[PDB]
From a paper:
Biuret hydrolase (BiuH) hydrolyzes biuret to allophanate and is part of the Isochorismatase-like hydrolase (IHL) protein family within the cysteine hydrolase superfamily. TrtA is a member of the isochorismatase-like hydrolase (IHL) protein family, similarly to BiuH, and has a catalytic efficiency (kcat/KM) of 6 x 105 M−1s−1, a KM for triuret of 20 μM, and exquisite substrate specificity. TrtA and BiuH are members of the IHL protein family that possess the catalytic triad comprised of a cysteine, aspartate, and lysine residue. Interestingly, the active sites of TrtA and BiuH are almost identical in sequence, and so it was hypothesized that triuret is the substrate for TrtA, funneling into biuret metabolism.
The triuret hydrolase (trtA) gene (NCBI accession number PKOI01000001.1) tested in this study comes from Herbaspirillum sp. BH-1, which was isolated from a biuret-fertilized potato field. To remove a possible intrinsically disordered region, a C-terminal deletion was made for crystallographic purposes. TrtA elutes as a dimer by size-exclusion chromatography, and the monomer adopts a fold typical of the IHL protein family with six parallel β-strands alternating with six α-helices (Rossmann-like) in addition to a two-strand antiparallel β-sheet at the N-terminus. Helices α6 and α7 provide most of the interactions between the two subunits in the dimer while α4 also has some contact at this interface. The α2 helix shows the highest mobility as illustrated by high B-factor values in the apo crystal and undergoes a significant conformational change (∼4.5 Å) when triuret or biuret is bound in the active site. The catalytic triad that has been previously defined in the cysteine hydrolase superfamily is present in TrtA. It is represented by residues D24, K129, and C162. Also present in TrtA is a cis-peptide bond in the active site between residues V157 and T158, which is signature of the IHL protein family. In the apo WT structure, beta-mercaptoethanol (BME) was found covalently attached to the catalytic cysteine of every subunit. The other chains in the biuret cocrystal that do not have biuret bound, as well as the apo WT crystal, are in the open conformation.
Numbering used by the authors:
A (entry chain A), B (entry chain G): 1 to 219
């Protein structure tokens, strides 16, 4: 039983019944000249968390905890990609179009791959999700129930989209979720900040948040 | 084909493939002397939208659109209520305890009921949901697919919790969602405003938003 100083009150977990979930740490969103930059976004806040996510992964692997990685991705034939999502915003470079690191949001492309320095090792779960929420159209809920997981440590990008959605999904499904605040990032500083406040608002309506240092202190 | 002025760009729908979703307009959350007020939340901003929500309901009923209502609710034995949800916030009066309008978040209690001013009528879907998201553990998705619904008009409370969760779920599932901005409300005005900005961010990443007057204009 490990007790972590957290907002809005201390967070308790057992490593055996806890998993680390690292959401969408994908080359196209984070690397200089990748698709993120092209759309005009500041990738720097995302690159700046890479060392903290790496230390979270090493903490989980040392503790022998389950590790889940997610990738936002579609089948190369775009058959799991809703028409709504493909048309949304009439993008010049849309899902499946050739971007700087290959076909945008497509399974097996270089830009779709998880950063090498945070990449999955053998024994870790890897979920390809067609939506922002890690639980929609995936077997993530079933896989965690098979492993008797009750508690999630959450990290990744972006805070107000995939992280928030996945965390809201997990909260509804009965998981106790701790987002590691310095291991999440957004293209929008204000969205990052208000999302973290929303998640722990009203006595922890979605869950808990703490910096890496409080997690390391607990273990 | 009705065309509505909206952010981030005009929203087009056909009434035969469009449903109004009115989320959690329940007595304990909105009435003076309800559990919401007892907890020290100021319910006046939720009460303030009831006439706008009733106008939106009357608009959808006159256009013959499908109308879906949601209630956050649990079986009296709380067998569909995760233990996490019951312990969260170490509450003084928690789920299933007796509040000013009956057992908190329990089906059939006066507090659990949708406001008479927004009551469902015959031929409307009424969804009881054990979470914040209208799609989790409901047949909502299957009911909308069965009736060939592709577009949702979205209203209710609270903006940053059940409205935002339900809209993010609906986006992932391939629905085109227009949140009717003055027909949603939050205990926290800044969470209300910034939720609307996140939902339409990045050229419409979750969906569209517009005031009721713009929807009234298109019909």
């Amino acid at each position: 039983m490990i007790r972590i100083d957290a907002t809005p009150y201390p967070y308790q977990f057992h490593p055996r019944s806890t998993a680390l979930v690292v959401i969408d740490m994908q080359r196209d969103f984070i690397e200089e000249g990748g698709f993120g930059s092209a759309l005009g976004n500041d990738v720097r806040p995302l690159a700046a968390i890479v060392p903290t996510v790496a230390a979270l992964l090493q903490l989980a692997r040392e503790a022998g905890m389950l590790v889940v990685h997610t990738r936002e991705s579609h089948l190369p034939d775009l058959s799991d990609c809703p028409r709504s999502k493909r048309l949304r915003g009439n993008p010049t470079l849309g899902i499946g179009d050739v971007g700087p690191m290959g076909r945008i949001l497509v399974q097996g492309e270089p830009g779709n791959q998880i950063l090498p320095q945070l990449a999955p090792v053998e024994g870790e779960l890897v979920i390809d999700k067609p939506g922002k929420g890690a639980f929609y159209a995936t077997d993530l809920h079933a896989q965690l129930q098979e492993r008797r997981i009750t508690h999630l440590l959450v990290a990744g990008v972006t805070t107000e989209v995939c992280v928030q959605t996945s965390m809201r999904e997990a909260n509804d499904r009965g998981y106790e979720c701790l987002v590691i605040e310095d291991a999440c990032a957004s293209y929008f500083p204000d969205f990052h900040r208000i999302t973290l406040e929303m998640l722990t608002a009203q006595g922890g309506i979605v869950g808990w948040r703490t910096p890496l240092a409080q997690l390391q202190a607990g273990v």
